[PDB]
Design a protein around this ligand. Structure first.
Ligand SMILES: CCCCCCCCCCCCCCCCCC(=O)OC[C@H](COP(=O)([O-])OCC(O)COP(=O)([O-])OC[C@@H](COC(=O)CCCCCCCCCCCCCCCCC)OC(=O)CCCCCCCCCCCCCCCCC)OC(=O)CCCCCCCCCCCCCCCCC
Ligand SMILES: CCCCCCCCCCCCCCCCCC(=O)OC[C@H](COP(=O)([O-])OCC(O)COP(=O)([O-])OC[C@@H](COC(=O)CCCCCCCCCCCCCCCCC)OC(=O)CCCCCCCCCCCCCCCCC)OC(=O)CCCCCCCCCCCCCCCCC
Ligand SMILES: CCCCCCCCCCCCCCCCCC(=O)OC[C@H](COP(=O)([O-])OCC(O)COP(=O)([O-])OC[C@@H](COC(=O)CCCCCCCCCCCCCCCCC)OC(=O)CCCCCCCCCCCCCCCCC)OC(=O)CCCCCCCCCCCCCCCCC
Ligand SMILES: CCCCCCCCCCCCCCCCCC(=O)OC[C@H](COP(=O)([O-])OCC(O)COP(=O)([O-])OC[C@@H](COC(=O)CCCCCCCCCCCCCCCCC)OC(=O)CCCCCCCCCCCCCCCCC)OC(=O)CCCCCCCCCCCCCCCCC
Ligand code: HEA
Ligand code: HEA
Ligand SMILES: CCCCCCCC/C=C\CCCCCCCC(=O)OC[C@H](COP(=O)(O)OCCN)OC(=O)CCCCCCCCCCCCCCC
Ligand SMILES: [Cu+2]
Ligand SMILES: [Cu+2]
Ligand SMILES: [Cu+2]
Lengths: 203, 79, 145, 552, 312, 42, 139
């Protein structure tokens, strides 16, 4: 125990030196996100099959999409992605507290998105459309609520990463953790853009 | 068809084939060298065996040094 | 300096990486696997009571048998507390050597007993059984340090 | 001038040195061993389900099974053997040797691959746990078509546990794919370029991509089904495209599933031929392209399992089904080329490896017969198809996996499996296998749809069914020599004190102690070609391996 | 030799079945030739043992034969392309969709048995002024003015405005040869005529397969809404007599108990049968009246008992 | 290095000389460490 | 990472071609136009490969040739500090057990068990993630 057998300041360090070699955690998370894309591909396939089999009026008469509320939440999610990228820029630097601020406001705006989605859900539910009530309602709820579960998981990842930043000194490993969390958040917002264009605009 | 015949067939053909294949294969000389007979001369290279029984100070080789054989006994015999 | 006749190469570090043709083996010991296991079990836990490393040397030990026994005991990892029983059937000779630390623990009194146990079984015609019996008797004789 | 080695290596080990590793093990080598042991346990459990089917199907009457009990058997047998023995054991072999074969010390995320194994184990258990419920396991087929899986049909709990058991097990497979693909991309030896890593590592790499492409779709489909069952979500309502939606969703996963089950063991077979043929894998650059083409084509030829539905663009999938057979043909010819003009020694790894060629070909030849819709019409959903994918699966993931087990048992245990017992096990398996399934081509060619619990005595093909049952029980006893061999060879059996118990090894995994040191290596050789270990062990061949190479 | 080489393919009874059998024979010949040559290669390279005369000299160690790889990756493409062309030309006669069927059979397959409707009959020689009923196709539009809520919802229905419990896709006919669990249904068809089958499933997917037709189709619940071409035609049935037919997709527990028959009788026999069924009679009675065994002679409605060891 | 090596004197009292050994159970001297195999068999 | 990126680029090209041809030949020559299931699945597996290959290409252009990716590279060239690889850990089995609890809660429709399993999954993932960052107890 003279100084240390492993001459490392942090008991936890990057999986490989990222300056010369690929960031292993980034590679892994990117691959996993590429898989979640196929998960949402299955959901999209369900929705599009239901749309094709619909008899002209794709959203049934009882259902009426509240675009007035679905546009603010989409803009909030885009803003969440932008502020998350700012947090990543802080993470690349040693700005522990800048990262924490950016990710905290990211988490707050993602939570606002989740709450707005829930508000639209209850509004639609009381206005007839429900999962057992219609094929449209069911595919829409399946897709949008699986995305909502992904957003909730992203929020959990954000708060968990913030807790981790609170307990150990900022290091390249922890910056990489923030980077991969941001990759997940960006993937979530991209799939939300796809879902928004498919549901509300393409209809 | 012949419930008893079918049951006996499914229960016995595997057993008969297993016995035949075991006789063919398990009865073959293995790759293990045959036991050394005392009458024959010792052709194998010198064999030294050790217990690995105790803990040898530190695991690393360096630092063991060579204190010495320090022989502290003896014996002899001729079978 | 020369590596094994075929397929063995010295690596970047000291260790030599060897190979064997698929059909054959590596140890090539001329004893049954089961009584090899029995002798290993003896050396391993029938000697734990002795707390002195018990070693067996079946190879030949020529010229002055006692002296060659000494300088092959030198090869035991810790000869200080070690008991090497060497049998050369090329000479029908048995030699037991002891370390300095393993002395006065009944080892000296057990030497004739171990040698006799080895000799009886050897004249009966069982090298491995005799080695096992000698190890058992000697280990029973020795007391922990 | 002599070493002090134990008379025999340690048989088992001290009390309590393993149980805590299993719980906490982050070593891929041990995790791979856990995969292999657990996967084989599900093979025996899943295989036993077929013996009950075999015994019942030996006679026209329903001797001891019921209609639904038999229905649960092929659902869980097909499920267990594929998803709990065949798919989890590719990552069992990958974890076993893939880090060794690229020079890496560990996998990219070694706590993640530990999670993948436990997700596999516990996910598998809850799926098989449908049996303990009074209703039974999932009665619907392994394919689990849409309306039959709705809450209306098959309402029991066992069907639901099956759905979630695959979702849990599926996640472990997805995560395992992330490790193997990230390990290959990131963790590699300082000299091992992507075009010099062995064929098996390449095969696992492309298989991992297929896993990532396929399994998430299944999880999406399974949740959609689970949503439909528990919430009436009309996702697979037949009035929608539900019946063809599920088949499109499932088979889009399904057909890649039968190829992630195949490609890894093509690599294992490709690893075994060069070492025992004493010559390079014939056409290395061609095999990697063939493997890449198969994975690319497998995604877009999914629907050739839906020819009978009469709801798919029939010509399109048939063409690509004929197009995906050509790459597999190239791979098959290359393996023979590797065996060509080579000093073949048919040890138990080759014996199984050659058996794979014989069984796979006949199953493969029947595969193209199924690729023709006009032929697929009459022969679809019959025992001819049951005979097809068993000659192909059993050939590809029983003969090859056993070859991998026999080939790599010393490299993970330090002990050699008995050759005589291995030869007995092979011929029992080979003679047993061809007996059980060869007649099933004729069985299904004449009218006998699969998934039939009983048939009339007046219906013909009663003699074939008993012949099939005889073969399966020959297969049933064939696993006794193997289990005995492993049981008495793990703790006993000729130890290997050298690298390459099979001389002329390649792939850099034969450049380390047969029980590899933790972190896989104490010595990484200068990697120059596709055969680093061979180059190291036989330096004189280094020049020859370059000179004779081009001639072909 | 053809029967043995067909690997247990029944000799077809329709022009389509005969053509499919010929394609199968050709494809099996090609597959056996390929298998024979490849197995010969394997058993001939198995002659390359490690000869003891092999001194310390390793094999040729070549690998990497580009011209050979090109040849053996060109020829399989040729073989599979020829097979694909033959497959396409045979497929063309899989459903010719002749707009003038000689007899249309509405095959509706419910959970664990069959029903055949005889939707329409129109003989080319001129006969059978017969037609399907379709008064009973009643929809289940859940278009109530208001639901649980007080107003606004005016729910129409989940799917295309209707309810999954619709059954409108099913078609019904005057002459229904429903198959009971204890009476195997026997769809009787005239020999030598073009027989169309309009396929539907009442509850779940399953598969109509007459093994001697050398053709099967999957009766799905709502094929039109699932983009499935359920309806398929058979140009002719030469041989008369009783031909077994089976269910070839998962139906549920009693999936193996859905066997039926397609008894092909002469056109005059079909005249008599249809007349006697228009007259109040059952399928067995009509068969007996036309002097043909009433019960399925190729299969029995085997025991409803769960099995042999059940105590009755 | 923010840890201090521990040392303990545990009051001992069978003399663990006929039974289990530290090689088999590393902490034999620290507590009840071996049940007679006869107990498990019966 | 040139070859690593090129693998996914080739896969993306093939899957894009497959998706396009499937969409066209299903919009025309199919019973009901575009299938909308195979089409979407092919499009989004093209997206899978496109994302992975684009990231790999970005990395390849951002990175100088590594010893791993460099032909004729000596072992000493890559010799150095490899990064942190997690040693023994018992959190993965707890994560698997928690997810299994949530899964059985979903199968047997038990919302209480689903909630318990999700809480356990959160706890176990927190433990795994914090395993190598939890500081010493401050007393
Ligand atoms: C039933 C009854 C339940 C009773 C449970 C008690 C909970 C509250 C009491 C403890 C809070 C406390 O002392 O905080 C002061 C504590 C001061 O000590 P510190 O040195 O600064 O850090 C705390 C540790 O001493 C040193 O920790 P560290 O600095 O190494 O960081 C470790 C980190 C890691 O701890 C974690 O586990 C964080 C990860 C949380 C889970 C992430 C997923 C959750 C899902 C998110 C949903 C997304 C949508 O913990 C924290 O986040 C620190 C805050 C402490 C409270 C933790 C929250 C629980 O932290 C603060 O500075 C204030 C935090 C206030 C948050 C408390 C909110 C918890 C719930 C309150 C209501 C109580 C339950 C009612 C039901
Ligand atoms: C726990 C679950 C609770 C319920 C289980 C019932 C009893 C629990 C016993 C404790 C379980 C355990 O793992 O402790 C090891 C325990 C020995 O204690 P230890 O701490 O291992 O002692 C160190 C060894 O002496 C020395 O270490 P070692 O590494 O040499 O151990 C040698 C061993 C194992 O060598 C290994 O390194 C194998 C490690 C992985 C293999 C198993 C992976 C399974 C992981 C899944 C979850 C387990 C945790 O290999 C062999 O000699 C076996 C030959 C292979 C048989 C043929 C296969 C074909 O094993 C036993 O004596 C009982 C057998 C355990 C498994 C059998 C029960 C499972 C269910 C029945 C069979 C299922 C088949 C079809 C269904
Ligand atoms: C659908 C099923 C969802 C699966 C989601 C998990 C799959 C992700 C695997 C690939 C990601 C890359 C990776 O290797 O993961 C690292 C890591 C493996 O650690 P390792 O192998 O020891 O190597 C060190 C890491 O590479 C060192 O990197 P790291 O430890 O720092 O990892 C960074 C981020 C790694 O990046 C991410 O994984 C992004 C997280 C997105 C997942 C959000 C869930 C979306 C699904 C909800 C709808 C269903 O770690 C975080 O700080 C955030 C983790 C938040 C996970 C929240 C999951 C809660 C699920 C329950 C939601 C409740 C709502 C439903 C009701 O995996 C995880 O931490 C995820 C735990 C697995 C959760 C399975 C849930 C069952
Ligand atoms: C049969 C075989 C198949 C079993 C299937 C069941 C698998 C799950 C149970 C095993 C999980 C625990 C474990 O592996 O033992 C760790 C632990 C040894 O830890 P160590 O690293 O060697 O500790 C050394 C020093 O203490 C210092 O080491 P340290 O620095 O690592 O700290 C001590 C370690 C030690 O912490 C613990 O011992 C926590 C024990 C957690 C038990 C979870 C029970 C799940 C129910 C399974 C039913 C069976 O660290 C902590 O995490 C302390 C914080 C406590 C966290 C409590 C988290 C609850 C998570 C709940 C998630 C929801 C899952 C529901 C499913 O083993 C035990 O002492 C507990 C005995 C096993 C529990 C039996 C459960 C009945
Ligand atoms: C490892 C598993 C595996 C592998 C490799 C394959 C490989 C192939 N499969 Fe397989 N298949 C399954 C597993 C597998 N399959 C399973 C599990 C089912 C499920 C049954 C069901 O649910 O329907 C199935 C079902 C299945 C069906 C549906 C049957 C039906 O439902 O009616 C069809 C075609 O219709 C098919 C075709 C093919 C083809 C053309 C190949 C080929 O890609 C490769 C094999 C064929 C060869 C010909 C290889 C040999 C080639 C040469 C020697 C070159 C020279 C020869 C020629 C050019 C002919 N498969
Ligand atoms: C990896 C995949 C795999 C493997 C290895 C097998 C192996 C076998 N299969 Fe497989 N089979 C499938 C995958 C597989 N099968 C699939 C996917 C289907 C289609 C399912 C569907 O359509 O729904 C199928 C269908 C299927 C059917 C049709 C069921 C039906 O439709 O009615 C039959 C009928 O005999 C059968 C038989 C066999 C036999 C005899 C073996 C043998 O080779 C198995 C060898 C047997 C053993 C190894 C057991 C012997 C061991 C013991 C007795 C010891 C037991 C010990 C313990 C339990 C601790 N299989
Ligand atoms: C797998 C999960 C199960 C299967 C897959 C489910 C996937 C769904 C995902 C997200 C959906 C979220 C949005 C849901 C809210 C949308 C509105 C709605 O659903 O409509 C109201 C209806 C009542 O309708 P009603 O009786 O007719 O009365 C109308 C009154 N006039 O509520 C409902 O049933 C909806 C309740 C559904 C809760 C699902 C919770 C999933 C959590 C699982 C945790 C992970 C499990 C891991 C598994 C390995
Ligand atoms: Cu397929
Ligand atoms: Cu059926
Ligand atoms: Cu049916």
């Amino acid at each position: 125990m003279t100084s240390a057998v492993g001459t490392s300041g942090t008991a936890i360090t990057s999986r490989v030196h990222s300056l010369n070699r690929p960031n292993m955690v980034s590679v892994g998370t990117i691959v996993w996100l590429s898989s979640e894309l196929m998960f949402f591909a299955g959901l999209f396939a369900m929705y599009f099959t239901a749309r094709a089999q619909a008899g002209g009026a794709w959203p049934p008469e009882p259902t009426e999409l509240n675009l007035a509320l679905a546009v603010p939440v989409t803009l909030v999610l885009i803003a969440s992605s932008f502020t998350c990228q700012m947090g990543v820029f802080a993470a690349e630097r040693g700005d522990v507290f800048g990262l924490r601020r950016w990710y905290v406001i990211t988490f707050l705006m993602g939570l606002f998105f989740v709450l707005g989605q829930g508000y639209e859900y209850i509004h639609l539910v009381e206005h007839g459309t429900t999962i057992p009530g219609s094929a449209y309602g069911s595919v829409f709820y399946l897709a949008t609520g699986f995305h909502g579960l992904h957003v909730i998981g992203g929020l959990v990842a954000f708060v968990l990463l913030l807790a981790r930043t609170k307990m150990s000194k900022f290091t390249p490993a922890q910056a990489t953790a923030a980077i991969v969390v941001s990759y997940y958040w960006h993937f979530v917002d991209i799939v939300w853009i796809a879902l928004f264009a498919t549901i509300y605009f393409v209809r | 068809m012949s419930t008893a015949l079918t049951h006996g067939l499914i229960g016995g053909v595997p057993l008969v084939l297993f016995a035949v294949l075991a006789l063919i294969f398990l009865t073959r000389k293995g790759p293990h060298p045959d036991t050394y007979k005392m009458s024959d001369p010792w052709t194998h290279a010198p064999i030294l065996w050790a217990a690995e029984e105790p803990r040898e100070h530190g695991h690393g080789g360096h630092g063991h040094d060579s204190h010495g054989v320090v022989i502290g006994g003896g014996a002899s015999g001729k079978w | 300096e020369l590596d094994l006749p075929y397929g063995s190469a010295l690596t970047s570090s000291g260790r030599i990486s060897a190979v064997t043709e698929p059909g054959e083996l590596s140890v090539h010991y001329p004893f049954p696997t089961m009584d090899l296991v029995v002798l290993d079990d003896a050396l391993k836990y029938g000697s734990r009571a002795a707390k002195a490393r018990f070693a067996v040397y079946i190879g030949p030990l020529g010229a002055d048998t006692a002296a060659t026994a000494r300088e092959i005991l030198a090869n035991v990892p810790t000869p200080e507390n070690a008991v090497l029983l060497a049998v050369s059937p090329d000479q029908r000779a048995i030699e037991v050597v002891y370390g300095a630390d393993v002395k006065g623990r009944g080892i000296e009194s057990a030497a004739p007993l171990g040698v006799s146990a080895a000799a009886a079984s050897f004249k009966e015609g069982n090298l491995i059984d005799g080695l096992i019996s000698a190890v058992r008797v000697m280990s029973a004789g020795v007391s922990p340090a | 001038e002599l070493e002090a080695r134990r008379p025999f290596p340690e048989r088992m080990g001290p009390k309590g040195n393993l149980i805590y590793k299993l719980i906490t093990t982050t070593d891929h080598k041990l995790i791979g061993i856990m995969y292999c042991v657990v996967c084989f346990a599900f093979f025996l459990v899943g295989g036993l389900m077929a013996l009950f089917m075999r015994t019942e199907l030996a006679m026209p009457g329903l001797q001891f099974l019921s209609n639904e009990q038999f229905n649960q058997l092929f659902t869980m047998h097909g499920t267990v053997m594929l998803l709990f023995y065949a798919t989890p054991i590719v990552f069992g072999f990958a974890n076993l040797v893939l880090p060794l074969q690229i020079g890496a010390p560990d996998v990219a995320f070694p706590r993640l691959n530990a999670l993948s194994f436990w997700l596999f184990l516990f996910g598998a258990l809850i799926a098989i746990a449908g049996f303990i419920t009074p209703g039974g396991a999932a009665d619907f087929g392994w394919t689990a078509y849409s309306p039959l899986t709705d809450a209306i049909h098959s309402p029991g709990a066992g069907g639901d546990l099956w759905i979630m058991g695959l979702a849990v097990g599926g996640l472990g497979t997805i995560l395992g794919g992330v490790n193997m693909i990230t390990t290959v991309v990131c963790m590699r030896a300082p000299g091992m370029t992507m075009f010099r890593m062995p064929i098996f590592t390449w095969n696992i790499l492309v298989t991992s991509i297929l896993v990532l492409i396929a399994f998430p779709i299944l999880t999406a489909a399974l949740f959609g089904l689970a949503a439909d069952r528990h919430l009436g979500a009309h996702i697979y309502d037949p009035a929608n495209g539900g019946v063809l939606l599920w088949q499109h969703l499932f088979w889009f996963f399904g057909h890649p599933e039968v190829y992630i089950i195949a490609l890894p063991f093509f690599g294992i077979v490709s690893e075994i031929f060069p070492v025992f043929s004493r010559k390079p894998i014939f056409g290395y650059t061609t095999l990697i392209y063939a493997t890449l083409a198969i994975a690319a084509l497998s995604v877009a030829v999914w629907a050739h399992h839906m020819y009978a539905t009469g709801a798919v663009l029939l010509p399109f999938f048939s063409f690509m089904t004929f197009l995906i057979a050509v790459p597999t043909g190239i791979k098959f010819f290359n393996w023979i080329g590797t065996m060509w003009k080579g000093q073949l020694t048919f040890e138990t790894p080759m014996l199984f490896s050659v058996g794979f060629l014989i069984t796979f070909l006949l199953g493969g030849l029947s595969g193209v017969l199924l690729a023709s819709p006009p032929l697929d019409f009459h022969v679809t959903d019959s025992y001819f198809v049951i005979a097809h994918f068993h000659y192909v699966l059993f050939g590809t993931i029983v003969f090859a996996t056993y070859a991998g087990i026999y080939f790599w048992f010393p490299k993970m245990t330090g002990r050699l499996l008995d050759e005589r017992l291995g030869k007995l096990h092979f011929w029992l398996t080979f003679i047993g296998f061809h007996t059980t399934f060869l007649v099933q081509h004729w069985l299904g060619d004449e009218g006998m749809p699969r998934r039939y619990a009983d048939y009339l005595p007046t219906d013909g093909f009663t003699t074939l069914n008993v012949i099939s049952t005889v073969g399966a029980f020959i297969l049933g006893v064939s696993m006794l020599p193997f289990v005995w061999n492993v049981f008495k060879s793990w703790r006993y059996g000729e130890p290997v004190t050298v690298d390459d118990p099979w001389g002329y090894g390649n792939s850099l995994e034969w450049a380390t102690s047969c029980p590899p040191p933790r972190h896989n290596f104490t010595e990484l050789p200068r990697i120059r070609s596709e055969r680093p270990a061979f180059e190291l062990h036989y330096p004189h061949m280094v020049e020859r391996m370059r000179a004779e190479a081009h001639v072909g | 030799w053809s029967d043995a080489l067909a690997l247990g393919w029944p000799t077809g009874i329709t022009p389509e079945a005969k053509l499919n059998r010929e394609l199968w024979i050709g494809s099996v010949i090609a597959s056996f030739a390929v298998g024979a040559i490849v197995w010969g290669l394997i058993f001939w390279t198995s002659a390359f043992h490690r000869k003891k005369a092999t001194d310390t000299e390793l094999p040729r160690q070549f690998g990497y034969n580009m011209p050979l790889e090109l040849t053996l990756t060109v020829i399989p493409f040729l073989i599979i392309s020829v097979l694909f062309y033959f497959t396409v030309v045979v497929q063309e006669r899989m459903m010719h969709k002749d707009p003038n069927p000689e007899v249309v059979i509405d095959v509706t397959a419910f959970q664990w048995n069959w029903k055949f409707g005889y939707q329409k009959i129109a003989f080319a020689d001129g006969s059978f002024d017969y037609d399907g009923a379709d008064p009973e196709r009643k929809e289940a539009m859940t278009s109530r003015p208001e639901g649980k809520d007080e107003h606004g919802i005016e729910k129409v229905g989940p799917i295309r405005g209707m309810t999954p419990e619709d059954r409108t896709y099913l078609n019904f006919d005057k002459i229904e040869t429903l198959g009971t669990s204890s009476e195997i249904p026997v769809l009787v068809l005239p020999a030598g005529k073009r027989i169309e089958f309009v396929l539907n499933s009442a509850d779940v997917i399953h598969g109509f397969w007459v093994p001697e037709f050398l053709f099967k189709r999957d009766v799905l619940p709502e094929p039109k809404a699932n983009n499935s071409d359920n309806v398929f035609q058979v140009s002719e049935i030469q041989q008369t007599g009783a031909f077994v037919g089976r269910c070839t997709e998962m139906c549920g527990t009693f999936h193996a108990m859905m066997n039926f028959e397609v008894r092909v009788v002469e056109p005059n026999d079909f005249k008599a049968y249809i007349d006697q069924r228009n007259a109040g009679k059952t399928n067995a009675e009509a068969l007996a009246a036309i002097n043909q065994p009433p019960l399925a002679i190729t299969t029995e409605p085997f025991e409803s008992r769960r099995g042999e060891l059940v105590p009755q | 290095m923010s840890s201090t090596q521990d040392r303990s004197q545990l009051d001992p009292e069978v003399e663990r000389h006929t039974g289990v050994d530290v090689e088999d159970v590393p902490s034999a001297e620290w507590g009840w460490s071996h049940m007679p195999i006869g107990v498990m068999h019966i | 990472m040139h070859i690593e990126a090129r693998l996914f680029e080739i896969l993306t090209a093939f899957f894009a071609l497959a998706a396009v041809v499937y969409a066209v030949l299903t919009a025309m020559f199919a019973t009901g136009g575009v299938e909308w299931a195979g089409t979407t699945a092919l499009v989004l597996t093209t997206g899978l490969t496109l994302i992975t290959g684009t990231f790999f290409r970005f990395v390849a252009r951002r990175l100088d040739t590594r010893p791993e990716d460099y032909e004729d590279a000596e072992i000493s060239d890559g010799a150095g500090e490899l990064g942190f690889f997690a040693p023994h850990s018992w959190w993965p089995i707890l994560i698997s057990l928690s997810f299994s609890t949530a899964a059985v809660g979903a199968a047997l429709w038990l919302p209480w068990l689903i909630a318990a399993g999700v809480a356990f999954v959160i706890t176990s993932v927190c433990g795994l993630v914090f395993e190598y960052y939890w500081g010493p107890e401050k007393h």
